[model samples]
Target: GEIVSNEKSGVCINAPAKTKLQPSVFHQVFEGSKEPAVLNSKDPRLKTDFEEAIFSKYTGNKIMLMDEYMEEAVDHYVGCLEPLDISIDPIPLESAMYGMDGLEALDLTTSAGYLLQGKKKRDIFNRQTRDTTEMTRMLEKYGVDLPFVTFVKDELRSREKVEKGKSRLIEASSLNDSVAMRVAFGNLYATFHNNPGTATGSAVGCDPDVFWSKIPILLNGEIFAFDYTGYDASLSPVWFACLKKVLIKLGYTHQTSFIDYLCHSVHLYKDRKYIVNGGMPSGSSGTSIFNTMINNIIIRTLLIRVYKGIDLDQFKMIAYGDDVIASYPHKIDPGLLAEAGKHYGLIMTPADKGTSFVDTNWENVTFLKRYFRADDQYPFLIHPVMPMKEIHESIRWTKDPRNTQDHVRSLCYLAWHNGEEAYNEFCRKIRSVPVGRALTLPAYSSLRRKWLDSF
Candidate 1:
């Protein structure tokens, strides 16, 4: 007899490869140990008590301080390890109809047939009869007869419905497409309008006469971009703080901050850049503090590209030390616009010494190999699958120094796991705190609030 059950706690054993064994035998072999279970494996009822004792001894009653506890916290990330093959199949057309026999065997349909069968069915019928010679020629060429044709038409209609559903789902799920397009357009507009020539300081800084003097200002600005934007520069301190807060607020005993939020964003958008003429480069450079700001600019640029046919040329450009300001173009070829963006990223050098430039038909630009953008930019930057509120909240949480340490710790965990919800929630919570109230919360918080207010 076959048993149907969804409950996961059943005691049944089935061995497909080896000999089957009873539950009692399996438990004895797998769960039973000879040394009387050093970790107290036998006491299901006392498991909580045993855990408490172990945690108290190992982590001084602070669960977060324990390595095992931290590992447990990270266990949720295991799901990400499952491989995802998201590549889309090319749309089937006459050119793609080479393997019609195989495609027919699979029962897949085409959209063209459905189109003909719908409101245009009368036209198709009339054409088929009046242009019998052409129709017969086409059918003969494709090695298809009336039965195959009928199957194709029926499958095509089915395919149309599936395609429509898929299109709707894509529209619903593609939260970032519009946003990315918009940001791309805005960036293009800003780049061409605000920082077209000397405003970018490429020529001024590259010039031997003014290079030495201007180089320092630019380098310092770039290195301290996050600080300038009111973000934490160091990793350890900020990361620790973020972890503390996130653990408390979301789990049981931590707090978080805006810097943490930025760090998380940095982790996300580390390697992402504008796609121009088939190339991508790092979008911006800044401290952990300016992560969200950079993401905002990038997202805005992307949004413009989707809805308005704009590109990256519209953005305003700024490069201070490691800090960067990228403006997109409002009216330009997306490929060329991206090329210009790559160019801007490449041009930022202390002395323009060790930068490599890539020039394509769309545009040309350089980048520092030493400080290349992160490799996992798509998931980090757009974070389309993640809820926006969590990211916003995380940004908000890092605004205060008292909470800075907590926020920093949380960010480290968030970064490792791509926990957009935690990150966004932290930002939202911080933003909800009134400016005056924030001033009274912590030293770092007051400073961040003041800086943000000024901005």
Candidate 2:
């Protein structure tokens, strides 16, 4: 058994990279002028592998219908490339939803009932800082009476309390054998893999926001920000009700999550430990579903409520999850957003939070280190150039010395990016290799090939 892993671990790459990357070969590539190359995705033969893995354990028809609609939604969303409108008030949620035990609570099918048919109680963790119930008053304020309000609250609080910090490691199920292996494959593929070259939210996304959200227009001589935070958490059932109305109004049937995908979760909090109610889990596709739905709520509200004196179109907005960034041509006080957020039961972070930069000031901000702000002055495309010290640290930290190939690939990429200065400088370092670097340019390709293939 060779040792552990790299950044995107477990997820295998069909390319076949070298386990033991040699530094000497990097020297040759640096001195010999090997141009930088793009990392490619997996092979065609394994397309089935990806599809089957994500399908999860939906019922025979559920998977079929969902995927059919999923492709439809994905294609439509991608095609329309629509923009809708747009966190952390930690006032512990004090409200409660009565279980279907009461006659009024007994409207829906006990279908979601199957999950907790036996458990007397469950504690569903809210990835959200506060419970979604906190948004109730806001919905009423907007005169939006959500029909399934109770269901939304109950759905989110839906996890049956489990004791383990870790999920039980059962032998991989044949139905969704791929779940454990599916890492960050999501956003990369979800947002915009199909249309490469064109920005689908910017590789790491937020590109559309930067452009639309950053128009620094002054309202009455003051700049107004349309900021949104905790956007995902604030999504109230009221908004979902509106969306369902719109969906059915348009003639499409939808599957509510009382079934499968919406269930995976973390430890339960003190509040719901003895209660039979549950809510949406942390990583569900439903979480993202709310993202799109909530964005629509924002835009729809702007249209319906019509913030007096403020031109909606003049306000540019973009959101990917709770990250809502926008600017208005006019100035409005923070209370305006707060009051609206309160009524909608949507928890909103201060508008002060947001992002930008185009042909102007340095673009992009660091999100975890690997995904750096894209294309800053004197661009090196892709990701930011990793420093040599970090490179060495990566090499030192790896389980196998050969795994250091990833780090070496970094060296060549940087050297080629920076040219002679970087190449010569790196040489001083590689020459220092105690392993006796016996590497070269063409040889570097094999090393690169090995690293690439392993992804």
Candidate 3:
């Protein structure tokens, strides 16, 4: 065993001293070269191994289990890929739905006794159908004199809202990343590979945990949750282990308690435990921060173990929260990457499902929600892809003109990104707005000229 240092307790330092991270390290590692490495080849055997790991029916089962809670709602929303003319009316949700005891309360009036009495009356008549008079009589007898109104949700329409939980995470994680990982990468660890000419690219995907299961909430040296068994151990062991291993091998031993604090601070919604497998409660601090650093470690460990021969200092890698893109000159076996992913509870995207390591000249690489194109002087060119669906939806919204501003901005963004031809086409369309046809054009032209000139 390595000797423990009493001077600063080298095992793992406290979070306060460890939280300060330098921002420059991120730019250094992820910045792609102008004439980047071309992927030469992949070992067919290794490719098969990677496929077997990710594409197995068993893997599907795991993903299904993780996504079980939100799959129906998520699918219902995505199915809106086909638009509908009808809009759904919103029902004011009962306050009872938000509280613990209220959700469990039952109304005695609508219980089994009333339902059985109604059934008995119907049986006595032996009537296949009940007339309005009989229906009125039955209702009056049941003490239920209320007009019928029903609410239905149209699951096929595009909608937007200020998601309280989701919105807060955006604010929190933006700061979380800057503070947490800067320290880790700045002084705690270093890479051991370079982005060589004959490099391979790979992507690994993470399953959402909020819908998967509730994990431990480490508060004030105590663990709290509905249950803390099996996957309840999801955050602590695997994350800590991966992080410890990656850090130690990269030759740092004193600055891990920051990770310890980050890993253990896993709080979920206290009252919303019944809302399906407890996912990380909305707006929970440090969820993505913890997620991102571990993924970075996963990628780092893969490089250190598999891509050992090459100089590891300049490896091309970028991970934004869960999205990771790593390029290497070596063939970088997918089998090993898959194995590394499994060790850390990740499901690497199979080759058949999406892009995996391949040889390319960076012609059409999609990173950070934009397409990457190679250029002679200006490499890493990012251009917006055509938003046909958004364009069509904006056109449809113009029928009401409530979202005419949305329509205008949508066209403006397209024109700004695409070029003059798009500007001219969209300019004409903008002028044709029925309500503010002429009035809007002047402002649109002013903004367009300003945007183009500024860019």
Better of 2 and 3 by TM-score: 3
Model 2 misplaced stretches (Cα beyond 4 Å):
1-234, 256-280, 289-293, 299-306, 309-311, 327-339, 350-404, 407-455
Q: Please give, for residues 43-105, the per-residue lDDT of candidate 1 as tens digits.
A: 332323432332121111111232332232222211111122211222223212222221211
Q: Residue 360, candidate 3: how far off, in angstroms?
A: 4.8
- The digit string of per-residue lDDT tens for model 3 on 121-140 reads 23322223322353235434
lDDT of each: 0.25, 0.30, 0.31
The CA-based lDDT of model 2 is what? 0.30
Off by over 4 Å in 3: 1-237, 240-270, 273-290, 307-310, 333-336, 350-361, 374-411, 422-455
TM-score each candidate: 0.16, 0.36, 0.38
